[PDB]
Design a protein around this ligand. Structure first.
Ligand SMILES: O=C(O)[C@H](O)[C@@H](O)[C@H](O)[C@H](O)CO
Length: 310
């Protein structure tokens, strides 16, 4: 019980990013599972606007499918702000376990009230600081840096707390802000830094891995609800296939991105053990302060699930 249908899937990252390629994989599996009747059309590189517009497109129904970072969802469902807290997850295995577990599900379950279906979580990843003013090797080096952040009170508060001038901006305006030096820097996973070419305008990279961002793989509830059960199954089955593909592609892409950026002679720094503990001490107080704007129960439940998986 599948009728011919065309499905639009916009997103912000470049087409050849790992998640870009995972979106093409989703389209192929949807085709395969529906004998070519359900055709997904991918619009990468922000062609359908940034996360915030994609989100609104799905709620209204001009778009069907997207993936977005959790941070712009905090603007709808504040509990999603939890993932902008630094150092939540020690590694990708913990993140997978927590996100695929009850604490991840509790958050996804809040989406239908806002007109969205959270099909599952994909991996954006560990974020790393890039900038064009000077090497960042010490907490103090962040002082006064004009750093773009995702558009969220948690992201803004965290980096202001670390001494930056935190400048919320949509991802889709970021390359130009970096190139014109309207902003000194940004922070994102390595494969994004690479595939969106931020290295061409960011001579300095710090391997800080300070925050882990999930993507949410989203469907418009208005559109999803009008589908037949056989059609919903194609989408959810393809979503499960594509999550596994995405996460594997993301992790390989991280390894490849690091190699490329080093071989291309980007200047790479890290936070020493001493600097890392200075970071944590600065971080504790308004992590504590920010629980009230996220949701105490979400924060404590995520932190507990992460301990149990680690
Ligand atoms: O810096 C950001 O805002 C995110 O890290 C990007 O991954 C966006 O979510 C993009 O729109 C996803 O395609």
């Amino acid at each position: 019980d599948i009728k011919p249908r065309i499905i639009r899937f916009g997103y912000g990252l470049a087409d050849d990013s790992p998640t870009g390629k995972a979106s093409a994989h989703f389209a192929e599996v949807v085709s395969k599972l529906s004998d070519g009747k359900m055709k997904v059309k991918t619009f990468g590189n922000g062609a359908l606007g940034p996360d915030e517009q994609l989100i609104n497109s799905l709620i209204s129904g001009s778009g069907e499918i997207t993936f977005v970072s959790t941070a712009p969802i905090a603007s709808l469902i504040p509990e999603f702000g939890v993932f902008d807290l630094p150092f939540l997850f020690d590694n990708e295995k913990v993140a997978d376990t927590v996100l695929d577990g009850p604490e991840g599900k509790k958050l996804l379950d809040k989406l239908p009230a806002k007109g969205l279906i959270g099909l599952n979580y994909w991996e954006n990843g560990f974020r790393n600081i890039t900038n064009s003013r000077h090497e960042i090797s010490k907490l103090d080096d962040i002082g006064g840096i004009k750093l773009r952040v995702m558009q969220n009170q948690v992201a803004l508060s965290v980096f202001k707390g670390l001494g930056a001038n935190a400048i919320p901006m949509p991802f889709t305006e970021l390359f130009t802000a970096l190139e014109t030096k309207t902003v000194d820097g940004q922070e994102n996973p390595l494969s994004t830094i690479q595939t969106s070419k931020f290295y061409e305008v960011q001579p300095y990279l710090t391997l800080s891995n300070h925050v882990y961002t999930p993507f949410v793989f989203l469907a418009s509830k208005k559109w999803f609800d009008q589908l037949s059960q056989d059609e919903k199954d194609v989408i959810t089955q393809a979503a499960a296939d594509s999550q596994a593909f995405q996460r594997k592609a993301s992790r390989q892409g991280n390894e490849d991105a690091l190699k490329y950026l080093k071989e291309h002679n980007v200047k790479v720094a890290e936070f020493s053990t001493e600097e890392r503990e200075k970071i944590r001490e600065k971080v504790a107080p308004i992590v504590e302060s920010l629980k009230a704007k996220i949701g105490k129960e979400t924060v404590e439940g995520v932190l507990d699930a992460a301990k149990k998986a680690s």
